[PDB]
């Protein structure tokens, strides 16, 4: 059930399927003939992909939440690179 995400340098970022499916790209990356769990990213490096997995847990449980949601912290240097991978991951 758990989905393993591998970045460009090979560092893997295993994470739950339910939190992953909030991204349209990874929904359309595991689906089709890739159903076989295991996906790989040729372009995405690890440091930005670590932040994306950090965002995956943030989205699911803060959805339709009654309390005030704290802002998502993004590093100023990672901000440009994470934005570039935002549309590609569609999340």
């Amino acid at each position: 059930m758990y989905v393993k995400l591998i970045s460009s340098d090979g560092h893997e970022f295993i994470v739950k399927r339910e939190h992953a499916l909030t991204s349209g790209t990874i929904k359309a990356m595991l689906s089709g003939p890739g159903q076989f769990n295991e996906v790989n990213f040729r372009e995405i490096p690890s440091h930005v992909l670590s932040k994306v997995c950090m965002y995956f847990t943030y989205k699911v449980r803060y959805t339709n939440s009654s309390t005030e949601i704290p802002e998502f912290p993004i590093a100023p240097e990672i901000a440009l690179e994470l934005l570039m991978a935002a549309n590609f991951l569609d999340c």
Binding site: K59, N64, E71, A79, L82, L83, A86, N87, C91
Partner: protein, 571 residues
Amino acid sequence: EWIPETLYNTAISAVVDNYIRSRRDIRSLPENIQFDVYYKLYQQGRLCQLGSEFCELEVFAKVLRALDKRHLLHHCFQALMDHGVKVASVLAYSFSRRCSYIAESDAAVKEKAIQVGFVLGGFLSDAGWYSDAEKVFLSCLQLCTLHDEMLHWFRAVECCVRLLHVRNGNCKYHLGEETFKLAQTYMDKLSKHGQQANKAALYGELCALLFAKSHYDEAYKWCIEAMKEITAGLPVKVVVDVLRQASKACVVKREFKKAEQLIKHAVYLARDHFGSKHPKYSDTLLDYGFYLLNVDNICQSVAIYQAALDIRQSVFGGKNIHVATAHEDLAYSSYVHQYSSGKFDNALFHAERAIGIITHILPEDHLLLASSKRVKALILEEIAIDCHNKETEQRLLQEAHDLHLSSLQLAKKAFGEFNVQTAKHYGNLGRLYQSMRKFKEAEEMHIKAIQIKEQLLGQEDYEVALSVGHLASLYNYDMNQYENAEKLYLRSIAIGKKLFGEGYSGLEYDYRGLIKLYNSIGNYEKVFEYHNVLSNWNRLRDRQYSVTDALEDVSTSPQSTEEVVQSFLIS
């Protein structure tokens, strides 16, 4: 219910707050990413950083390819033009500067410039900056006339159709004729070399240029010529532009049946592909409301202009020439709607905005001021009549008297003495001089307005009938020669019921004129009859006047693209 922000939107605000350090590398982002960075700068109000990169042609080239979010680029582009920096002027100059540098270069690099020129020139034409779109189009036209190839004349004709569009809205009608003649040079050359270029949009632009110069006989001749060459394979923007300007020529030709089947389909076709909040859709409503303004559809003519202005206001920011023209029609529509009530409160405010927007962006001698200042002067005339204080009346009439002649002079220079618009101002001055107590000058103005407007339009026209009514209303009160107005008034009712029926707004002041004429000489066998006519007038139009707008009137159209074209052409 506190939906968390998307990581796409969250990362946008993460780089905007660090814009200065990463300013160079933002230009390396993808186009879909790049636009949202800039749109966030406008949303944060950082227009200076937003304007710090739109002044470059290359940066604005990538941004222009966000076709879905073009409606947001227009709202940001207008914000910069109210912010200060003339991003329209520098982009046009920068493109024209780089355009001449590849004249001796290959056609591979050259063809990219025309593609850049059309998207940028089309955008500025959409944004209204016609004075800067012309310099863009003149540069790309120059490239198309350097190397003789079959594709080069295929796009040189595409420059002249849009060159003639940026000169129709900029009131450069004198140079408009030359562009059409220059267009025929490449158009005929392409026709000889086995390529019959489509003369639909190019002939469609004369449906507005000749309409603007009141060449209704020539415009309607070119209305038929433009409508024939339409094709289902044409772009929808091209098709709807033909229908709008073809419908306008029919309204002034005193033909109403074939005009409404054209313009309603133009409204329907524009709303379908583009939407209800697109600039092209609002451009149709102003032309559509022109039909409603002349067919005595006065109740919804104000609403359709009010709807048209709100579309442009939601997309075209603040001080934009397209908003002023939308302000212009609504200012005049309320002028005739509030005529009996006298509630020219928003009428002057729209007119005041119409002066305010144009004077900031157009030169003081531009002809669009003459059209704009005319309606505001008409607002000032009726306001002074309604006001109780005579000291206020004597000042506001002179202020309106200032605007008409300043407007008339601009019309005289660009249109010539023998034209409808120059005679249109003569009719306004005659009514103005009635309020100015210059009755002898009013008589001179009215006879000028009726010996010139009737001379070229003909004995039967809508505006000629009104010009008679202005002088008919003169002899009733100031000159007191009721015999002269007896024949004049009889002409006013005569032309009124040919097309507008009995229940026309101008005929109310015409039937009342006959009773007032008859009341002076003691005639009463017609006063009792014409009192019953007013009772018939008071009911019959109000029997069929119930509230009904025009956006749901058109609704879905059973008529298709071809069902409208052939019906108008054969008849």
